[PDB]
Amino acid sequence: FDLYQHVTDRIIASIEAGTPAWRKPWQMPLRSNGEAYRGINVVMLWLTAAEKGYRSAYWFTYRQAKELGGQVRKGEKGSTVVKFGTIEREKKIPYLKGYTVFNADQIDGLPEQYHRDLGTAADPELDAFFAATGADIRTSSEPRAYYNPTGDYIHMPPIATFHSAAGYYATLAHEATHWTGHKSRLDRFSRFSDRKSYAFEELIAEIGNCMLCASLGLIPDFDQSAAYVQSWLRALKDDKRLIFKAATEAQKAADLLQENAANFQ
Ligand SMILES: [Mn+2]
């Protein structure tokens, strides 16, 4: 009946139940046109695909199913994704409403199309991605990986100390996600830092890093972020639209990375 709550409570459950929704992939969800879902809806459809065991990336509405050449298997229940309708004021103002979609594995008769390994060394195509992001990446024998907004650079340790390029680039993807949201770019940090503002950042960063790593073929590192799920639980309980604001920032952090990395002069 209430959307923000309804969605926040699914996410609060997943956290308690073990895995927060957005970690569940370890294929990104698509609409009937091939356009990928964004933001909070990627998160929601991921948890939904895990919880119902879906193999397909595609989600349809009853309308999209029927008038495409198919039928929603009766008994099948959809799940709630997010979008905007309009109210009039003086086709005018947007407002957030939910809606129901069904995965392709709940549907019969749909058309035909509908259903790596990196060692321990530098990878050229990954190196080109992060070089094309624009990020000051500095390397030093200091054994910590971090983003310093004050200098505005990412510091990686040396790749060989990782004994895993997959571990090396996931960590970099994570820092690249933080690197967005410096004042010159996405403008996301708190002004005055504390246990709450670090908690928000690394949640945006986490959700965002899953989104990034899904595209780059990497696996996110979740050891580093075990001390926060409680603040996330607390903040998610006290604020029923907080998860929407995080997922929107997260998607913007992934978008900025990939868009820069394709800024072909
Ligand atoms: Mn971080």
Residue numbers in the entry: 7 to 32, 40 to 103, 111 to 135, 143 to 292
Quote the study that presented this structure, word for word:
The two histidines of the active site helix and the glutamic acid of the glutamate helix have been shown to coordinate a catalytic divalent metal ion, usually zinc. However, gluzinzin metalloproteases maintain the catalytic activity with Co2+, Mn2+ or Ni2+ too due to the flexibility of these three metal coordination geometries. ArdC showed increased thermal stability (assayed by ThermoFluor) in the presence of Ni2+, Mn2+ or Co2+ (ΔTM> 4°C), but not in the presence of Zn2+, Ca2+, Mg2+, Cu2+ or Fe3+. Moreover, to know the conformation of the active site when bound to metals, ArdC was crystallized in the presence of MnCl2. ArdC-Mn crystallized in the P32 space group containing eight molecules per asymmetric unit and the structure was solved at 2.7 Å. Mn2+ is tetrahedrally coordinated by H201, H205, E229 and an H2O molecule. H205 is oriented towards the metal by interaction with the conserved E228 through the non-coordinating nitrogen atom. The E202 residue of the HE202xxH motif orients and acts as a catalytic base for the activation of a water molecule that coordinates the metal. The H2O molecule could act as a Lewis acid to allow the nucleophilic attack. By analogy with other gluzinzin metalloproteases, the conserved ArdC residue Y255 could stabilize by a hydrogen bond the polypeptide chain to be cleaved.
R388 has 35 genes assorted in functional groups or modules, among them, a gene coding for an antirestriction protein called ArdC. Interestingly, ArdC contains an N-terminal ssDNA binding domain and a C-terminal metalloprotease domain. ArdC is structurally similar to DNA-binding dependent metalloproteases involved in the maintenance of genetic stability such as Spartan or IrrE. In summary, our results indicate a new mechanism of DNA antirestriction played by protein ArdC, by which plasmids increase their conjugation host range.
